[PDB]
Design a protein around this ligand. Structure first.
Ligand SMILES: COC(=O)C[C@](O)(CCCC(C)(C)O)C(=O)O[C@@H]1C(OC)=C[C@]23CCCN2CCc2cc4c(cc2[C@H]13)OCO4
Ligand SMILES: [Cl-]
Ligand SMILES: [Cl-]
Ligand SMILES: [Cl-]
Ligand SMILES: [Cl-]
Ligand SMILES: [Cl-]
Ligand SMILES: [Cl-]
Ligand SMILES: [K+]
Ligand SMILES: [Mg+2]
Ligand SMILES: [Mg+2]
Ligand SMILES: [Mg+2]
Ligand SMILES: [Mg+2]
Ligand SMILES: [Mg+2]
Ligand SMILES: [Mg+2]
Ligand SMILES: [Mg+2]
Ligand SMILES: [Mg+2]
Ligand SMILES: [Mg+2]
Ligand SMILES: [Mg+2]
Ligand SMILES: [Mg+2]
Ligand SMILES: [Mg+2]
Ligand SMILES: [Mg+2]
Ligand SMILES: [Mg+2]
Ligand SMILES: [Mg+2]
Ligand SMILES: [Mg+2]
Ligand SMILES: [Mg+2]
Ligand SMILES: [Mg+2]
Ligand SMILES: [Mg+2]
Ligand SMILES: [Mg+2]
Ligand SMILES: [Mg+2]
Ligand SMILES: [Mg+2]
Ligand SMILES: [Mg+2]
Ligand code: NA
Ligand code: NA
Ligand code: NA
Ligand code: NA
Ligand code: NA
Ligand code: NA
Ligand code: NA
Ligand code: NA
Ligand code: NA
Ligand code: NA
Ligand code: NA
Ligand code: NA
Ligand code: NA
Ligand code: NA
Ligand code: NA
Ligand code: NA
Ligand code: NA
Ligand code: NA
Ligand code: NA
Ligand code: NA
Ligand code: NA
Ligand SMILES: [Sr+2]
Ligand SMILES: [Sr+2]
Ligand SMILES: [Sr+2]
Ligand SMILES: [Sr+2]
Ligand SMILES: [Sr+2]
Ligand SMILES: [Sr+2]
Ligand SMILES: [Sr+2]
Ligand SMILES: [Sr+2]
Ligand SMILES: [Sr+2]
Ligand SMILES: [Sr+2]
Ligand SMILES: [Sr+2]
Ligand SMILES: [Sr+2]
Ligand SMILES: [Sr+2]
Ligand SMILES: [Sr+2]
Ligand SMILES: [Sr+2]
Ligand SMILES: [Sr+2]
Ligand SMILES: [Sr+2]
Ligand SMILES: [Sr+2]
Ligand SMILES: [Sr+2]
Ligand SMILES: [Sr+2]
Ligand SMILES: [Sr+2]
Ligand SMILES: [Sr+2]
Ligand SMILES: [Sr+2]
Ligand SMILES: [Sr+2]
Lengths: 160, 186, 92, 95, 154
RNA sequence: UUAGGCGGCCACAGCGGUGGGGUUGCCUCCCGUACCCAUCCCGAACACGGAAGAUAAGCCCACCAGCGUUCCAGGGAGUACUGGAGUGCGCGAGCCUCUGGGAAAUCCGGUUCGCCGCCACC
RNA sequence: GUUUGACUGGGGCGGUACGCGCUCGAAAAGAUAUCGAGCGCGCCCUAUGGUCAUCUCAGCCGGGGACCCGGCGAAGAGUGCAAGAGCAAAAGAUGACUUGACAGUGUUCUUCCCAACGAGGAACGCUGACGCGAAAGCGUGGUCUAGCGAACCAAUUAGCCUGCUUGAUGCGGGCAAUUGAUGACAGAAAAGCUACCCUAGGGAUAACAGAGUCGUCACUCGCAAGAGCACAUAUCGACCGAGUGGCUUGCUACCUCGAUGUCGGUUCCCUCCAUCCUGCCCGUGCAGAAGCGGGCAAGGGUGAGGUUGUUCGCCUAUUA
RNA sequence: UUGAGGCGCCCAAAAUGAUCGGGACUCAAAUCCACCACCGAGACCUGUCCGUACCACUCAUACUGGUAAUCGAGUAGAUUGG
RNA sequence: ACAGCUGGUUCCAAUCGAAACAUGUCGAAGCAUGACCUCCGCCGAGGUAGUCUGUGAGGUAGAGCGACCGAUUGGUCCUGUCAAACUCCAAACUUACAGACGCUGUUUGACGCGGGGAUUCCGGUGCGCGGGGUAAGCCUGUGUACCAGGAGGGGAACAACCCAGAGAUAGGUUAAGGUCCCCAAGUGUGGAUUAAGUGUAAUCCUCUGAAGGUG
């Protein structure tokens, strides 16, 4: 199904699992990547992926953008490299689909999406100075797999 | 105490001094309350009405101000209790109070007890208080005949301070006589 | 539900509280001499009889209590408002 | 509404804030009001008896007598005049 | 004391806003009223802010406007110095204009219509779709700004 | 109020903590069961009778802020949201300007370890 | 001779949003719809009702998942049943007593916001008689909001009124009220077929077509994992993301029901490009030949046949 | 070397004849920031008249005088004079 | 014959001027009772469409959750997220009553009461807030203004977008919008950008243009 059906915040917040049954599991395998034993303050460089438009990003898009981002970091910095990436948004919004015409139209549960407001950090990676251009490329691949245009903003790093 | 949602009881409930449920049922009558309170050594009797910023006492009587009329005897007993009620009731009649309802507070409604004696005294003074005759003590126990027949089992004296030996409940009679007389300074 | 056969309650006849006996209202037999019985005979001819061609309707899932409260001293009965009870059994 | 009972949509107004929980103080339950007095109508969640229909929460009526211990308070619902039977526990004096 | 002028018509205007204008004695477009600066009156102009033009006028401008557009409570009659002398508590238009600005009296209290029925703006106004800060003619004006408007509506 | 009783508001009063206070006075703990009364068993409690002892409890007085709570300052924030208006911007979801209102979290610093009423009383 | 209901993104089938209660939807007063989301009621209880006395619960800790002692413990226990709400010297628990789950008659609110409408319901009074308690007081059933039913007729309860000139007897008529059901729940006693059909109307409403939409369908683009002996990008290409079209399908019910003739085919004309051939090009896993992929390009061409009504499709021989 | 902003470019395929209403326009006849002067309703201001309402006078609802910034659009429908 | 269904129902003018909603209905193409419109009589001094202040009611937006509740990360306290049916908090705002100002009423009698007559119970659209639906010139709410039943001016045309609410006639000045021609008014002024005919398109079924890319 296209994202055109779910990308906008046009419906109420539908998260309450005590009233909703049959919710498909999240396709997101990991949320804490790289070296999850080390601290975020132990790194000199902190670069985040900032979403420019207020959207709803599905669990399938989150997994696709996370996979294409972390796979590049595993390719360039190694499987046990000196970095740590975080996906801070979780898919709370439960999604429906009306799949009888418009009669009894309340749709059955088909998926989950993450409500991300404009200006928010979806991804945040902490790396060293020499690995900074490899992570900007991981985010360049990650923004092509989500709905809005994005900013790759450097938060802690006057090393240029 | 634990957090924002914690419910701390009302102050007089926290202190375990006022039974708020009994208080409402008491205040429903519209009549002033005959507050009958006790202590180990003394007995109190107040005529309380309802006020805007708190309760208003119109006429009180403690068993300590009983000696002012000629009571050389102890203050935490049955004869003392009646006389403290009679003294409160008479001061009430001079204040314009005609009727009342008995408030015993956290004390027990035990038949023949001191709080019912405080009530019998206040009724005898001229106050109209809703009562029950068979819940009150027999006239002789109110006199202190139970204390005199306890002094009959002597060997060792009951009272330490010198008042008398075999005890005089005739002092009760000599006190009710003084209070029933209208010439008295209240 | 359970109901006491004998109990103290108000008597509207004696104007005071007395011990009443509870009994279920037994259906009194029909005479067949009332106006409606005479109308059934008169208004019935060839074809449909209108109201007299109708057959008795259904039942409610639970009926109300149909009781008689008989006074112990004066011996007179009174009726009360019934309440929905699936079964009504008496105690003693 | 899904149902048209008296306590429909009254989760908010007939519930207390956790600190205002428990039995209410007797002083306001025995308060005496005179005829002509303007009184605010608000149900005390802790007091079960002597309540009015929740639709009238927030009204400022005029005491026009009493029925037993409860009061007869005159209000104007929209354009219609109504007389409400209400105890002091659910009333507060204006000003 | 502020000078209110209606610049936007009644059609599609909220009823509670149209009713406020009618309470402020202003029933037609280009009609002006002299409103005192009180708490009650401040709430009223704030409600009408988007369909009006207001501000404190100068003694000079108010005098010009009263001379040309003031009318009695009933009738055609010119409100000149001689009229003001014979019917008001003042000597000339200046004495009336001063009292109004200092909030000592009102036009009605002095036997005049509360409405100053102005002429359309000569050379036109700055527009009825934008406020003063955006280059339009709606809302609060400067004393120099309201004067230009009232003088153009002689 | 050199310790009491009845209260109003019902945490600004809660939780926790330190120090001080009682010869015929007060409140207590305390001492004791012939009685009124009492325990589905216990004078523990309730009830009654009483002063050998005590200030250790409670209670009353003075005080501490670590937790909870109330209010205030400054910061967050005139931000978030928002009533009225617009031939303002945006493909659009949406945003912006003008006008009238205006948070919450949190951080720092203050406040708060009850206030008030009636009565009685060296 | 009649009946065979209504609701409904046309109708039927399904369902009941056909009488009721709760939360949310509902936009912080009130009111508020959809075949809106979550889910209930058509009872049950003589105590599971009423009062009074005594008392404090979940859970956890410590000492001897039954029991016992102590401590912490405002409430997470319990309170018949949905949900939301109320309750701690109680509205909960235990114990004892008790029958107010009483008769009669009202006021008011609700039902039905505003704003008329019945039955039903609730709150709050009075009169009578009672229960409990020392008493104030509490008890008009269950802590609150669901558990309900007209007229006619019958049965039943207590007293009384009345039946044609009159008295007696029988048997009737009535005033007040209880019980018996109509769930299509403000109450008819009630099954279907019609392509043999008929009438009134409707584009208030379906089938074809138009129109809107674009999930579906077709086509494209971004990113490029992957494989392609090594090599992402000769070639193939997942996930995900962004779109264009208006050929498929679906949705809607705007237009036409006083009719805009339904599929397929044929014949004749015009057009579109997302190009199958033909012209000119770029790349190649381009030796050549034959290909694969891509670009410009709509001038012209794109044919004959076997099954099938077929569109579609399968098949044959020809063909640039 | 890197950051930000403005306008534009690529992405961008449809059926009888292309389009911003057309012509056409390029230091504009575009866009953005300011500014100047004008054109332009039945609105607003103004002369006269009409109706309606009300006021004064009146038997009058006949004249006459006065007031309306706060009267003058209207389907179904109610009312009234001709 | 009956029909709750379609069609038609003939002269002029003046005043006021709807409802397309609620309750019940074998009711949904119909009625009744309310709402609302109009007319008459009564009453006789207040009224309340706006604002301000005071005394009250409220849990939506937002926010937050070692504040309940239930969702929802990882590490050896720290670290990562949420809620239509959560709330330690909390607006704007809506709302009861009262006072004040405003407006209105006491010959135009308001507020209110009683009575006669209706029409109406297919609505639509814009905007704000919604709920369903991929969406819709979709379906279904709500507040409001409008079309319906609203002329005239502008928008190429075009019910509801902008100006504007309108007796006749006449002069004048503006509004929206516009001033190169068609076409009334500028080939106006100061300055800058754009080379694509971008653009010369407020709103929109109607005016597209996206992610991505651009020495
Ligand atoms: C169900 O199909 C029909 O009933 C065909 C016909 O009966 C043909 C009528 C021909 C006449 C008699 C009018 O000459 C008819 O009235 O058609 C309508 C009709 O008759 C005028 C025309 C309609 C109306 C919309 C356009 N469409 C074209 C023809 C048609 C074809 C259909 C159709 C409807 C229409 C209607 O159902 C699917 O096939
Ligand atoms: Cl005591
Ligand atoms: Cl029975
Ligand atoms: Cl009520
Ligand atoms: Cl005429
Ligand atoms: Cl108008
Ligand atoms: Cl061109
Ligand atoms: K047709
Ligand atoms: Mg709510
Ligand atoms: Mg005038
Ligand atoms: Mg001009
Ligand atoms: Mg202009
Ligand atoms: Mg000490
Ligand atoms: Mg736009
Ligand atoms: Mg049907
Ligand atoms: Mg509401
Ligand atoms: Mg019948
Ligand atoms: Mg029967
Ligand atoms: Mg019905
Ligand atoms: Mg009904
Ligand atoms: Mg036919
Ligand atoms: Mg149609
Ligand atoms: Mg034809
Ligand atoms: Mg091509
Ligand atoms: Mg060709
Ligand atoms: Mg006519
Ligand atoms: Mg006329
Ligand atoms: Mg929110
Ligand atoms: Mg119409
Ligand atoms: Mg010209
Ligand atoms: Mg163009
Ligand atoms: Na179906
Ligand atoms: Na006959
Ligand atoms: Na309370
Ligand atoms: Na001590
Ligand atoms: Na039927
Ligand atoms: Na009723
Ligand atoms: Na289609
Ligand atoms: Na498309
Ligand atoms: Na054909
Ligand atoms: Na070609
Ligand atoms: Na073939
Ligand atoms: Na008309
Ligand atoms: Na018929
Ligand atoms: Na109907
Ligand atoms: Na019909
Ligand atoms: Na006034
Ligand atoms: Na919002
Ligand atoms: Na309708
Ligand atoms: Na209109
Ligand atoms: Na036009
Ligand atoms: Na062009
Ligand atoms: Sr939506
Ligand atoms: Sr993107
Ligand atoms: Sr016969
Ligand atoms: Sr027969
Ligand atoms: Sr049945
Ligand atoms: Sr002892
Ligand atoms: Sr557009
Ligand atoms: Sr788009
Ligand atoms: Sr401010
Ligand atoms: Sr269908
Ligand atoms: Sr009850
Ligand atoms: Sr059948
Ligand atoms: Sr056949
Ligand atoms: Sr082409
Ligand atoms: Sr070719
Ligand atoms: Sr076909
Ligand atoms: Sr086939
Ligand atoms: Sr006219
Ligand atoms: Sr007219
Ligand atoms: Sr609201
Ligand atoms: Sr020029
Ligand atoms: Sr220029
Ligand atoms: Sr079109
Ligand atoms: Sr772009």
């Amino acid at each position: 199904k296209p994202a055109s059906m779910y990308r906008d915040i046009d419906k109420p917040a539908y998260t309450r699992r005590e009233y909703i049954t049959g919710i498909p599991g999240s396709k997101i395998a990991q949320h804490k990547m790289g070296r999850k034993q080390k601290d975020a303050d132990d790194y000199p460089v902190q670069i985040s992926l900032i979403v420019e438009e207020t959207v709803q990003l599905r669990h399938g898009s989150l997994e696709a953008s996370r996979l294409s981002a972390n796979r590049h970091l595993i390719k360039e910095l190694g499987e046990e490299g000196d970095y740590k990436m975080t996906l801070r948004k979780f898919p709370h919004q439960v999604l429906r689909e009306n799949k009888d015409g418009m009669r009894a139209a309340f749709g059955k549960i088909v998926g989950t999406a993450a409500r991300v407001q404009a200006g928010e950090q979806l991804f945040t990676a902490y790396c060293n100075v020499e690995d900074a251009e490899h992570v900007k490329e991981a985010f360049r691949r990650a923004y092509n797999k989500i709905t809005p245009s994005c900013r790759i903003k450097v938060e802690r790093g006057e090393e240029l | 105490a634990t957090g924002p949602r914690y419910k701390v009881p009302m102050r007089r409930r926290r202190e375990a001094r006022t039974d708020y449920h009994q208080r409402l049922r008491l205040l429903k009558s519209g009549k002033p309350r005959l507050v009958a309170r006790k202590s180990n050594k003394h007995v109190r009797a107040q005529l309380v009405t309802l006020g805007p910023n708190g309760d208003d006492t119109l006429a009180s009587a403690h068993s300590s101000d009983l000696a002012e009329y000629g009571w050389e005897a102890p203050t935490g007993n049955m004869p003392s209790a009646y006389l403290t009620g009679l003294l409160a009731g008479l001061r009430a009649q001079e204040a314009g109070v005609e009727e009342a309802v008995l408030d015993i507070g956290l004390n027990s409604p035990t038949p023949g007890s001191k709080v019912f004696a405080i009530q019998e005294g206040a009724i005898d003074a001229g106050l109209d208080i809703p009562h029950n005759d068979d819940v009150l003590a027999d006239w002789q126990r109110t006199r202190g005949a139970h204390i005199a027949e306890y002094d009959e089992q002597l060997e060792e004296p009951l009272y330490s301070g010198d008042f008398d030996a075999a005890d005089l409940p005739e002092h009760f009679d000599e006190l009710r006589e003084t209070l029933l007389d209208g010439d008295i300074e209240l | 539900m359970q109901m006491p056969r004998r109990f103290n309650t108000y008597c509207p006849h004696c104007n005071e509280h007395q011990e009443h006996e509870v009994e279920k209202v037994r259906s009194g037999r029909q005479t067949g001499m009332k106006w409606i019985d005479r109308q059934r005979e008169r208004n019935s001819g060839i074809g449909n009889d209108g109201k007299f061609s109708k057959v008795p309707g259904g039942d409610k899932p639970t009926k109300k209590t149909d009781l008689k409260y008989r006074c112990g001293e004066c011996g007179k009965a009174h009726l009360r408002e019934g309440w929905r009870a699936g079964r009504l059994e008496f105690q003693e | 509404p899904s149902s048209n009972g008296p306590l429909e949509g009254t989760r908010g107004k007939l519930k207390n804030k956790p600190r205002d929980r428990g039995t209410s103080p007797p002083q306001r339950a025995v308060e005496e009001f005179d005829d002509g007095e303007k009184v605010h109508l608000k149900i005390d969640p802790s007091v079960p008896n002597g309540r009015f229909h929740p639709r009238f929460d927030g009204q400022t009526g005029t005491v026009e007598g009493k029925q037993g211990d409860a009061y007869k308070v005159d209000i104007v619902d929209g354009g219609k005049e109504k007389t409400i039977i209400v105890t002091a526990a659910h009333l507060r004096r204006q000003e | 004391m502020h000078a209110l002028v209606q610049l936007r018509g009644e059609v599609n205007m909220h009823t509670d806003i149209q009713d406020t204008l009618e309470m402020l004695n202003i029933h037609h477009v280009n009609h002006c009223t002299l409103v005192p600066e009180t708490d009650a009156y401040r709430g009223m102009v704030a409600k009408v802010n988007d369909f009006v033009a207001f501000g404190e006028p100068s003694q000079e401008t108010l005098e010009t406007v009263l001379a040309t557009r003031a009318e009695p409570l009933e009738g055609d009659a010119d409100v000149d110095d001689e009229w003001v002398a014979e019917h008001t508590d003042y000597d000339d238009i200046s004495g009336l204009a001063f009292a109004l600005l200092s909030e000592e009296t009102t036009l009605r209290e002095q036997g005049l219509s509360p409405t100053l029925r102005l002429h359309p703006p000569r050379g036109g106004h700055d527009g009825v779709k934008h406020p003063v800060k955006e280059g339009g003619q709606l809302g609060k004006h400067d004393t120099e700004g309201i004067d230009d408007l009232l003088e153009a509506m002689r």
